[PDB]
Design an enzyme around this catalytic site. Structure first.
Site, PDB file in Angstrom:
ATOM      1  CB  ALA A 167     -10.460  -3.153   2.331  1.00 41.75           C
ATOM      2  CB  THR A 182      -0.935   0.037   1.216  1.00 39.19           C
ATOM      3  OG1 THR A 182      -1.790  -1.110   1.201  1.00 39.19           O
ATOM      4  CG2 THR A 182      -1.785   1.295   1.188  1.00 39.19           C
TER       5      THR A 182
END
EC number: 3.4.25.1
Lengths: 201, 228, 199, 248, 239, 213, 204, 238
Positions: free
Chosen positions: A49, A1
């Site tokens: 998420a 990420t």
């Protein structure tokens, strides 16, 4: 990420990767980590998420009602503040959220950073993610306020590539958005393996 | 027995809600027409003062980016109904990623207008016209204080309501176009209002399938009136 | 972790803080402000957690302004300081405790200048000087050495510059810039920013 | 008619239940405060002074409330004890919150918002009590305020009560002073005003009451002065009548 | 016949108890207000001091926030609740959303708080009408008004109180489409408008202006006396 | 002390075609080192164009299935129409987040047809984040099926091979080959293979046996 | 512990017709002082004081809550408060927080409002009253204060020797403590006047 | 006349007039006819126009896959009972995983409408529900009333001038148990045409027919699919 954002003379540049994992297992390679809130606002996904997916969709639910009741778009500092108060009520319960807020305003550009811990700060350059610390050095070595538009496209595309190289939790594709005065515009989306043939050659 | 919402008549029906239908009659007129090309909509302003700012008088509000509105009767109860009608279209997009249909907007609106004495207050004093283009094409609906909900092809309410309906049933047919229905609507308006029709007495609002924007006309309205 | 200072004078209050908004290794922002203008003669310095600094201090910020608009006049710095202590102690034995450290700086027309200290357990104090953070240890004995109750506002800036050079020398964190205010009978005046050419 | 509850207007703005309460206070006691530099005073009247009572409190009209404020009272006694226990409880809530005494205006508005709120809510009553205010603060010094049943108020320099003693307000203007407002100049004005309004002649000391408030060494003492020095204050005014007839 | 309730309708569709609340507004002192190029202005009349009271507790013009004003009519008790409530909302808006409060947002709060206060039985509505004047929303001068029914509305020049019909008819023949620049000219328009007072004593006018950047500027009875002098200077051209 | 969760196994496969969608799962229900039954399919026909699969904790799978089937009727009588494929994925994300601090232990895959007549596969997580994909494989044998479908369907790591779209008949034998290879190395997979095919003409079913050990 | 977070020492001692009370001046976190002017003795009416020691939060909190209830008591009744009555008032306030308790131990010293009779008592952190006739002590350095008062106290003492006994008891015991010191203030009251003195102590 | 004000107040004749007045609201609505065979239960309603070009107001509405109802009376009490009706149908699907028996669902309605006919603060429900359904023992035709009584029946007509429809049903009820849907539906809509003034005819735009069957889910036909039902009819003997 790995996400980053920086503002300059001609607006704001937003870039991110597309890899989402599960432990040591890669779930997907086509995750869109830059959530399109409005035609004039953009939000990112960094840490969790569904946590970044739900609350920014709830923020987009709130900014539309503000436009209908007042016949005017919301400001950038207003939307970052409304997001900070919703997350602060669940402090300590175990949320994870490190998103960024981008968009043009009547005061000009706009760039704020919102944590799940409660940090709401402004600034000029940011980089959020697990491989974020690999992106600060290559960006700040080439950053200037008076960069060109094609030069700023190559700087953020370089900086995501160096972050996905060293980090193991970063890869996939490189998305790239551009916030103009009227509204944001999608620039491109390039694979990392295509950039490896271009940069190393 | 005619001063209570909790009391019937020997014959039938309220009077209470019958008195609420009478509160619409002292409003302003409003005409909406459904056409296969889209839904046009007209209203009369009745501006009292020149110092009175004109754009603070609303008769067409934007419920959503493909649904317009029109109102008559009590202004105070109207702003309550417009508020949740914007929220219920917004809650539906939040949980379904789609636009709420024009029929099912008024389902949410009528569920609260029939709550005046049916909890565990008074009924409202406002009729509404809802125009919009959903997936079933262009639509035009109508409600009342009694929650009675229906679809209309061309409807005129407010003051001069019955006098508009007789002339409006004469010229309507199925194969209209949008630009024909706009100039057909304000022939009726200048026959039912008392002042001379100009660019400051009325305002228009249209909606199209591919042109979901523009529920308003901004001085183009001067072109329509000068060619009457 | 971050630093405050509270030099009190005979008719002035000299305060300064740092401008760092770091995140656990990196330094995300180097022009951060920790100074909250409560009124026309009262400032506010806040050091604590991530969200607890902004949420609580703005709750005090938008509650003293309510007193000004409703009663026509302004709070004293003593009554404003003793209202902030009331809100921590009432919201301490609950599910949401606020973990911040404060110090208040105000001038009064009848009492002159004043300084107040605040713990994260809501303990008031009336100090001739105060500090917070890990840098409070290395610097206050310097300020304990050269303090005089009758000191000019020009020597206080020079004493403040002596107080910050040792924090540049034997303190592990970076802390390059330091914004400085001053409060007198005229109001809050903004002095020049303090930076350090190290070598 | 329109003499129902207080939650209904008359055909034209004339809340009749509020007007009925504002006329009820004229058939009650008599209270007045006067101007003073470096001080303030109150004066009241002892009603029903029948010879089989004790007066164990020795303060009936006057209630010292915070530390530097007191108040008179006029109206329904059942509502009088409710307000005074409420009003003392306001000033200590402020003192717990800021550690500073209440500055003599927003104490009055705190009560006047309570007294108003019974005119809009339910089928009950407004407070049928008007009352005065004396006090000292940091910002303006000695003050006077006048409560109403409707929650309206207003500052004053000399005032009184209505249908009992509404003619005293004409006397306060005719014998008005401004600047020369010492306490002894005002106490002589007080016994002269109560002489005409209290229709019982010669003004026995057991029918009156005088309370003062001064500012001494930063302490603000409050005096409910005893009956012995009322005597030499009355006989001073009785002497001034025999001196005033020398022009005749 | 049938009124005595805020929930019942007339046989021709009216709410008389709501309509009676507007009759209580006509017992108040008149207050006017215009907007201009940069400087907004509002003035009130009928001071009428009574020789024995302090006049700083009878004030009819207050400020909700740093860049919005307030003038009202009706009865004094119900105005104090609305003013004290609106100071909270224009301060709590700033806490939840870090912007300053627009002049349009605070009028919807006052109207909606007066809205739900009319619906339920056993709740006597507010018998006041208010004027909200503020050049706050990004350099744009605006002024709105309220109504006891709860309808916020925008004018460009306003008059209320006992005798509003004469003043509102006066300003329609007086407010030029020529914008009143050189803002002492715009202040002289209000003093000419307030010259048609119920008695026109001259010294019973309390005009308060705002130059859209500073705070409130309460005028003194020496500067306002100078503007009353130049109004008589232009009146010398009649002969 | 009492623990509220247990793992039951299962493997769900979905492939979005050009004008079709294939949903496949096994019928083995197990717990620990025991076999409850050999006949328990994971396919659920929601509408005539949408099939959902539910793996993980079986007690939450029976609950979450009945909640969705209730809200299908609640949508219809309020709107006089049926839900789309994308509307169900938007509704399911709010249901999964509604118990954020006591989560369902269910992995979900929704496959079906859109309003244009093409295939659509939505994958999920136990908290409620989703995205539209072309093929996903959820369950216990999820790691043994994703690299092979990247080679055959996605054509990843291949050189000099054209990108022909996957036909219906070629997609059937790819599903029948991956579950034979997965049942060899995984212990939570076998005993049958229920296959549901969603086209514009309805929903077909087909059952292929596996090894029974 | 929580009591050892800020330190403190409060001593009261009964004389012949008079009573004395003393406390320290140091305010500070666990090892770092802050200031030397922290008030720990609060007047509650004339000829009647109270001393607090323990956690510095609850010292300033209870002294405001007790002042909240005292002024409401002295207005419903024209009289002042008796020293027995205040002890029952404080014990009610501490027992309401039975399971959320304040971390302080109050010491009450004063004279009778009618007669000259002195009164001393101390309470626990949950409100156990305990009256004595010689002395009460509270704070962190309690055991050092028992060693000085058991050897120096005399039954009938003038205000001269009573001041000199409580001075030597406070100086020699607090200098043995580490987290207490930096100055000692002494109040000695009687029927005619109130005398407040500060002592010359070690400032280390 | 003083006893004619509230639901609580009894009369000196022993008749509460407010319940007697809610029967009159049922006669305001239009007529509707329901009937059943051994295997099929069909209820047929009659639409009413509001204006000359507005849509006609619907009467028959779907409830469950084996339950459909008609309506006569207030539209406010119509959808208020429908939302109570749909909630109880899906609770048995969620808990018991079976469809409801029709006879015990209507007993929940009589318990629902009993409280606002006794306690002050809520008027009785002005409503005329006809109910058709399928439990395990065949079709059913039910009616309700605002006096909270529910009547099992084999044929029923309620609404405006519905007495003439009842006379047709009584002299043809012997034929209803055997005939199938091609005439059982047009046995029913021959009863509606006496509840009309004698000059106009039952067209395709003003009638709704709902059929639930033993092997057939409840289906509403209107305005397009009525034409295979209106074929093969005679006219009125005028």
């Amino acid at each position: 990420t790995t996400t980053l954002a920086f503002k300059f003379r001609h607006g704001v540049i937003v870039a991110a990767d597309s890899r989402a994992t599960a432990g040591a297992y890669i779930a997907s390679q086509t995750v869109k980590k830059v959530i399109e809130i409005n035609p004039y606002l953009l939000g990112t996904m960094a840490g969790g998420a569904a946590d970044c997916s739900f609350w920014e969709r709830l923020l987009a639910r709130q900014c539309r009602i503000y436009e209908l009741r007042n016949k005017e778009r919301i400001s950038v500092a207003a939307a970052s503040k409304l997001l900070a108060n919703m997350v602060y009520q669940y402090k300590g319960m175990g949320l994870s959220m490190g998103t960024m807020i981008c968009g043009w305003d009547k005061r000009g550009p706009g760039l704020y950073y919102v944590d799940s811990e409660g940090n709401r700060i402004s600034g000029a350059t940011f980089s959020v993610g697990s491989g974020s610390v690999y992106a600060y050095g290559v960006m700040d070595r080439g950053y200037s306020y008076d960069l060109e538009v094609e030069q700023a496209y190559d700087l953020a595309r370089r900086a995501i590539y160096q972050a996905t190289y060293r980090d193991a939790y970063s890869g996939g594709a490189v998305n790239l958005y551009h916030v103009r005065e009227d509204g944001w515009i999608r620039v491109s989306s390039d694979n990392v393996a295509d950039l490896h043939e271009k940069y190393s050659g | 027995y005619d001063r209570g919402v909790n009391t019937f008549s020997p014959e039938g029906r309220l009077f209470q809600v019958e008195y609420a239908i009478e509160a619409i009659k002292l409003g302003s007129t409003a005409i909406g027409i459904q056409t296969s090309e889209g839904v046009c909509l007209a209203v009369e302003k009745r501006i009292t003062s020149p110092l009175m700012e004109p754009s603070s008088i609303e008769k067409i509000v934007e419920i959503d980016a493909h649904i317009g509105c029109a109102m008559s009767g009590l202004i105070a109860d109207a702003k309550t109904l417009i508020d949740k009608a914007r929220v219920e279209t917004q809650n539906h997009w939040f949980t379904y990623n789609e636009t709420m249909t024009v029929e099912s907007v008024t389902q949410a609106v009528s569920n609260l207008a029939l709550q005046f004495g049916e909890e565990d207050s008074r009924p409202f004093g406002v009729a509404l016209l809802f125009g919009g283009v959903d997936e079933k094409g262009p639509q035009l609906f109508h409600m009342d204080p009694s929650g009675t909900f229906v679809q209309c092809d061309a409807r005129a309410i407010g003051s001069a309501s019955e006098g508009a309906q007789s002339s409006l049933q004469e010229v309507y047919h199925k194969s209209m176009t949008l630009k024909e229905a706009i100039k057909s609507s304000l022939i009726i308006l200048k026959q039912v209002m008392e002042e001379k029709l100009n660019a400051t007495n009325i305002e228009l609002a249209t909606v199209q399938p591919g042109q979901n924007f523009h529920m308003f006309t901004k001085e183009e309205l001067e072109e329509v009136i000068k060619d009457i | 972790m971050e630093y405050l200072i509270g030099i009190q004078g005979p008719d002035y209050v000299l305060v300064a803080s740092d401008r760092v908004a770091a995140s656990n290794i990196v330094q995300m922002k180097d022009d951060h402000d920790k100074m909250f203008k409560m009124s026309e003669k009262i400032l506010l310095l806040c050091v604590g957690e991530a969200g607890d600094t902004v949420q609580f201090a703005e709750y005090i910020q938008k509650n003293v302004q309510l007193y000004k608009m409703r009663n026509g006049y302004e709070l004293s710095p003593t009554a404003a300081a003793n209202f902030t202590r009331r809100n921590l102690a009432d919201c301490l034995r609950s599910r949401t405790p606020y973990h911040v450290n404060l110090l208040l700086a105000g001038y009064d027309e009848h009492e002159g200048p004043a300084l107040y200290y605040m713990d994260y357990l809501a303990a008031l104090a009336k100090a001739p000087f105060a500090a917070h953070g890990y840098g409070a240890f290395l610097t206050l004995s310097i300020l304990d050495r050269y303090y005089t109750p009758t000191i000019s506002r020009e020597r206080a800036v020079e004493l403040l510059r002596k107080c910050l050079e040792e924090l540049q020398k034997r303190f592990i964190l970076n802390l390059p810039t330091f914004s400085v205010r001053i409060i007198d009978k005229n109001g809050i005046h903004d002095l020049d920013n303090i930076s350090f050419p190290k070598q | 008619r329109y003499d129902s509850r207080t939650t209904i207007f008359s055909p034209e703005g004339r809340l009749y239940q509020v007007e009925y309460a504002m006329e009820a206070i004229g058939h009650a006691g008599t209270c007045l405060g006067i101007l003073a530099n470096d001080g303030v005073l109150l004066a009241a009247e002892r009603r029903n002074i029948h010879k089989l009572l004790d007066e164990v409190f020795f303060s009936e009209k006057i209630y010292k409330l915070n530390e530097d404020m007191a108040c008179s009272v006029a109206g329904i006694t059942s509502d009088a004890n409710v307000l005074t226990n409420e009003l003392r409880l306001i000033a200590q809530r402020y003192l717990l919150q800021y550690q500073e005494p209440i500055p003599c205006e927003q104490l009055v508005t705190a009560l006047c918002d309570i007294k108003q709120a019974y005119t809009q809510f339910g089928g009950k009553r407004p407070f049928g009590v008007s009352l005065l205010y004396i006090g000292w603060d940091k910002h303006y010094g000695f003050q006077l305020y006048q409560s109403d049943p409707s929650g309206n108020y207003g500052g004053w320099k000399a005032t009184c009560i209505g249908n009992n003693s509404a003619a005293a307000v004409s006397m306060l203007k005719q014998d008005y002073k401004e600047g020369e407002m010492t306490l002894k100049s005002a106490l002589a004005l007080a016994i002269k005003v109560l002489n005409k309004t209290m229709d019982v002649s010669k003004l026995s000391a057991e029918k009156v009451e005088i309370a003062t408030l001064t500012r001494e060494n930063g302490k603000t003492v409050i005096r409910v002065l005893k009956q012995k020095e009322v005597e030499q204050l009355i006989k001073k005014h009785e002497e001034e009548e025999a001196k005033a007839e020398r022009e005749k | 016949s049938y009124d005595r309730a805020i929930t019942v309708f007339s046989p021709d569709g009216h709410l008389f108890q709501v309509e009676y609340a507007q009759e209580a507004v006509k017992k108040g002192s008149t207050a006017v207000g215009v907007r201009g190029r940069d400087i907004v202005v509002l003035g009130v009349e009928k001071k009428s001091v009574a020789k024995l009271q302090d006049e700083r507790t009878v004030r009819k013009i207050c400020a909700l926030d740093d860049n919005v004003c307030m003038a009202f009519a009706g009865l004094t008790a119900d105005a104090r609740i609305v003013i004290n409530r609106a100071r909270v909302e224009c301060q709590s808006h700033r806490l939840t959303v870090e912007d300053p409060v627009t002049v349009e947002y605070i009028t919807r709060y006052i109207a909606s708080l007066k809205q739900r206060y009319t619906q339920s039985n056993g709740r006597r509505p507010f018998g006041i009408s208010a004027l909200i004047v503020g050049f706050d929303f990004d350099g744009t001068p605006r002024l709105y008004q309220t109504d006891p029914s709860g309808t916020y509305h925008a004018w460009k020049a306003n008059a209320i109180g006992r005798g509003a019909k004469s003043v509102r008819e006066f300003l329609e023949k007086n407010y030029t489409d020529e914008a009143i620049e050189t803002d002492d000219l715009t202040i002289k328009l209000v003093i000419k408008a307030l010259l048609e007072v119920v008695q026109s004593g001259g010294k019973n006018i309390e005009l308060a202006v705002m130059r859209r950047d500073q705070s409130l500027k309460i005028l003194n009875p020496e500067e306002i006396e100078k503007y009353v002098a130049e109004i008589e200077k232009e009146k010398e051209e009649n002969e | 002390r009492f623990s509220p969760y247990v793992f039951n196994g299962g493997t769900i496969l979905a492939i979005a075609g050009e004008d079709f969608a294939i949903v496949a799962s096994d019928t083995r229900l197990s717990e620990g080192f025991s076999i409850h039954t050999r006949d328990s399919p994971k396919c659920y026909k929601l509408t005539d164009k949408t099939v959902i699969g539910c793996s993980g904790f079986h007690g939450d799978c029976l609950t979450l299935t009945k909640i969705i089937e209730a809200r299908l009727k609640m949508y219809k009588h309020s709107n006089n129409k049926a839900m789309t494929t994308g509307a169900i994925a938007a509704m399911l994300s709010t249901i999964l987040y509604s118990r954020r601090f006591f989560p369902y232990y269910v992995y979900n895959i929704i496959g079906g047809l859109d309003e244009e007549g093409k295939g659509a596969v939505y994958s999920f997580d136990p908290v409620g984040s989703y995205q539209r994909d072309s093929f996903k494989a959820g369950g216990s044998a999820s790691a043994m099926l994703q690299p092979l479908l990247d080679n055959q369907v996605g054509f990843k790591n291949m050189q000099n091979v054209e990108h022909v779209p996957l036909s219906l008949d070629r997609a059937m034998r790819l599903v029948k080959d991956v579950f034979i290879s997965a049942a060899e190395r995984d212990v939570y997979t076998g005993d049958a293979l229920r296959i549901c095919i969603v086209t514009k003409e309805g929903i077909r079913e087909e059952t292929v046996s596996l090894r029974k050990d | 512990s929580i009591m050892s977070y800020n330190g403190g020492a409060v001593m009261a001692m009964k004389g012949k017709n008079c009573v004395a009370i003393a406390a320290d001046r140091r305010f500070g976190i666990q090892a770092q002082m802050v200031t030397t002017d922290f008030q720990k003795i609060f007047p509650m009416g004339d000829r009647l004081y109270i001393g607090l020691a323990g956690l510095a939060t609850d010292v300033q909190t209870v002294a405001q809550r007790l002042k909240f209830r005292l002024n409401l008591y002295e207005l419903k009744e024209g009289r002042q408060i008796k020293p027995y009555t205040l002890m029952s008032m404080v014990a009610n306030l501490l027992y309401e927080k039975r399971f959320g308790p304040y971390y302080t131990e109050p010491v009450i010293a004063g004279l009778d409002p009618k007669t000259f009779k002195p009164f001393i008592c101390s309470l626990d952190l949950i409100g156990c009253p305990m009256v004595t006739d010689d002395f009460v002590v509270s704070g962190t350095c309690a055991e050092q204060m028992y060693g000085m008062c058991e050897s120096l106290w005399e039954p009938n003492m003038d205000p001269d020797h009573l001041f000199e006994t409580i001075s030597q008891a406070m100086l020699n015991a607090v200098d043995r403590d580490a987290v207490s010191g930096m100055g000692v203030i002494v109040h000695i009251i009687e029927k005619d006047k109130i005398t407040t003195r500060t002592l010359k102590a070690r400032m280390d | 006349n003083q006893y004619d004000n509230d639901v609580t107040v009894w009369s000196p004749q022993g008749r509460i007039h407010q319940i007697e007045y809610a029967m009159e609201a049922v006669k305001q609505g239009s007529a509707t006819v329901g009937l059943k065979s051994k295997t099929h239960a069909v209820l047929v309603a009659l639409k009413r126009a509001q204006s000359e070009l507005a849509a006609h107001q619907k009467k028959i509405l779907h409830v469950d896959n084996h339950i459909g109802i008609s309506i006569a009376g207030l539209t406010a009490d119509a959808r208020l009972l429908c939302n109570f009706m749909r909630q109880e149908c899906l609770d048995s699907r969620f808990v018991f995983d079976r469809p409801l028996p029709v006879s015990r669902l209507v007993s929940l309605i009589g318990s629902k409408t009993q409280i606002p006919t006794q306690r002050y603060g809520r008027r009785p429900y002005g409503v005329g529900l006809l109910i058709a359904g399928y439990d395990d023992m065949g079709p059913h035709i039910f009616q309700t009333c605002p006096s909270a009584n529910y009547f099992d029946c084999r044929a029923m007509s309620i609404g405006a001038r519905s007495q003439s429809a009842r006379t047709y049903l009584e002299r043809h009820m012997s034929e209803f148990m055997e005939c199938n849907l091609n005439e059982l539906v047009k046995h029913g809509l021959r009863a509606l045409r006496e509840t009309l003034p004698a000059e106009q005819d039952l067209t395709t735009k003003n009638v709704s027919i709902g059929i639930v069957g033993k092997d057939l889910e409840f289906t509403i036909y209107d305005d397009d699919d009525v034409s295979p039902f209106l074929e093969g009819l005679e006219e009125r003997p005028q």
